[PDB]
Amino acid sequence: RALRVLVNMDGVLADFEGGFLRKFRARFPDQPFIALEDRRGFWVSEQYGRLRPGLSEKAISIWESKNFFFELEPLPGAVEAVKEMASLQNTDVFICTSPIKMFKYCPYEKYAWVEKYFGPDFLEQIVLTRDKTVVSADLLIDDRPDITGAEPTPSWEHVLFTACHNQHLQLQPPRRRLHSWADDWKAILDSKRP
Amino acid sequence: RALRVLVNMDGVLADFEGGFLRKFRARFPDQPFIALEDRRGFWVSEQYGRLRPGLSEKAISIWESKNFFFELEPLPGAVEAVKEMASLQNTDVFICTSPIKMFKYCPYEKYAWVEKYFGPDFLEQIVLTRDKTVVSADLLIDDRPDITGAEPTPSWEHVLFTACHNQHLQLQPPRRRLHSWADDWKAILDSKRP
Ligand SMILES: O=c1ccn([C@@H]2O[C@H](COP(=O)(O)O)[C@@H](O)[C@H]2O)c(=O)[nH]1
Numbered sequence: 217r218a219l220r221v222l223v224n225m226d227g228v229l230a231d232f233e234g235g236f237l238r239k240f241r242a243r244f245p246d247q248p249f250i251a252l253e254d255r256r257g258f259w260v261s262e263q264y265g266r267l268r269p270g271l272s273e274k275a276i277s278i279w280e281s282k283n284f285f286f287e288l289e290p291l292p293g294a295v296e297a298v299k300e301m302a303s304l305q306n307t308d309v310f311i312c313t314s315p316i317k318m319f320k321y322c323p324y325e326k327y328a329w330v331e332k333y334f335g336p337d338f339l340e341q342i343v344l345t346r347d348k349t350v351v352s353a354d355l356l357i358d359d360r361p362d363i364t365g366a367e368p369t370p371s372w373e374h375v376l377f378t379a380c381h382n383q384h385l386q387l388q389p390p391r392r393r394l395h396s397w398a399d400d401w402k403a404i405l406d407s408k409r410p
Numbered sequence: 411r412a413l414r415v416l417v418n419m420d421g422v423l424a425d426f427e428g429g430f431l432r433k434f435r436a437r438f439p440d441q442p443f444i445a446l447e448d449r450r451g452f453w454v455s456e457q458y459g460r461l462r463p464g465l466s467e468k469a470i471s472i473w474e475s476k477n478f479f480f481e482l483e484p485l486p487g488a489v490e491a492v493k494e495m496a497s498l499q500n501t502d503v504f505i506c507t508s509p510i511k512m513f514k515y516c517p518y519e520k521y522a523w524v525e526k527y528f529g530p531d532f533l534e535q536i537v538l539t540r541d542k543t544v545v546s547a548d549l550l551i552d553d554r555p556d557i558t559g560a561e562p563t564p565s566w567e568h569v570l571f572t573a574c575h576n577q578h579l580q581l582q583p584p585r586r587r588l589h590s591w592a593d594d595w596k597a598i599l600d601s602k603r604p
Pocket residue numbers: 224225226227258259260261262279312313314315316317
């Protein structure tokens with residue numbers, strides 16, 4: 217009865233691409249890097265691995281480091297939009313995020329980040345999972361183009377959230393984008409309501 | 411097409427009740443405690459709060475402490491059963507667990523625990539969520555009697571896993587139990603297959 221919306225964290229709420237580039241450049245000032253305009257494909261590490269030998273492992277070391285997730289800046293409009301979305305009648309919002317393989321800091325810092333920006337009561341809305349297809353909802357707003365897993369027919373419509381790495385991608389009809397949080401996300405939600 | 415089974419962690423895989431009692435008694439040897447045979451109701455803290463003033467907060471302090479989740483012993487047969495279950499043809503297993511409010515240690519230690527007992531490749535199968543009703547599957551094996559959330563009609567059948575706190579409960583037909591991991595869990599799975 218309530219519309220359920222899954223909102224991805226990295227690349228949708230949290231500025232993973234920007235934070236990564238900044239910290240990569242600072243730690244490795246003598247290595248080549250990929251400017252955001254030149255990013256292509258979900259996997260940062262893979263593009264860096266193509267750019268130079270040993271660069272994938274260096275890239276990985278940035279997001280495995282303590283404070284990487286906690287110190288990510290919110291994307292413009294993301295906190296305000298999600299707060300408003302959650303407050304709408306007949307609308308349930310969950311933050312759905314996939315932790316990295318190295319688990320020392322990432323889960324903890326993602327909870328801390330959500331507490332920081334959305335408050336203690338929002339922690340109840342976090343779902344941490346590597347497989348988003350087993351989470352049921354009406355909508356999933358997520359910057360990754362290919363979302364697959366154990367469920368071959370997920371219940372959600374995946375709305376692609378624009379990011380540097382996907383901005384040039386042609387989608388198969390009838391796949392839809394949310395171009396930024398300034399774009400009209402209420403229209404997208406409303407299209408799914410009775 | 412593959413049968414999907416959600417297996418709860420505390421009280422099903424990990425011996426939360428036993429670990430809690432042991433550590434409570436050791437930390438607070440002068441306080442009254444609740445023997446496992448006398449446990450009633452999901453909420454440990456609530457029963458302790460009825461037992462004596464200030465005991466709820468003392469109980470909470472045990473599972474908020476570092477190493478509490480990591481040091482939980484597996485329940486008898488749980489690791490062997492879940493390993494076997496995951497290896498079955500046409501069967502996908504996810505571990506579905508609700509972290510406590512205090513997030514400093516709990517998420518991290520639950521990942522570490524799953525790595526310890528099931529190996530690195532099993533980390534992909536963990537779902538951390540306060541709301542299990544938004545995770546879709548054929549079966550949920552979980553020791554908590556009342557499993558509710560944002561989805562009024564979850565896709566799973568909830569099979570109640572016996573625990574000290576629920577062993578006396580009469581369920582509404584046609585709700586079903588798994589009495590322990592020595593009980594015939596394959597029959598329960600098979601009952602859900604085409
Ligand atoms: O090349 C990459 C790019 C992203 N990620 C990880 O993928 C997950 C996606 O996070 P979210 O967008 O689901 O929040 C993050 O934990 C991020 O660190 C990688 O492991 N490798």
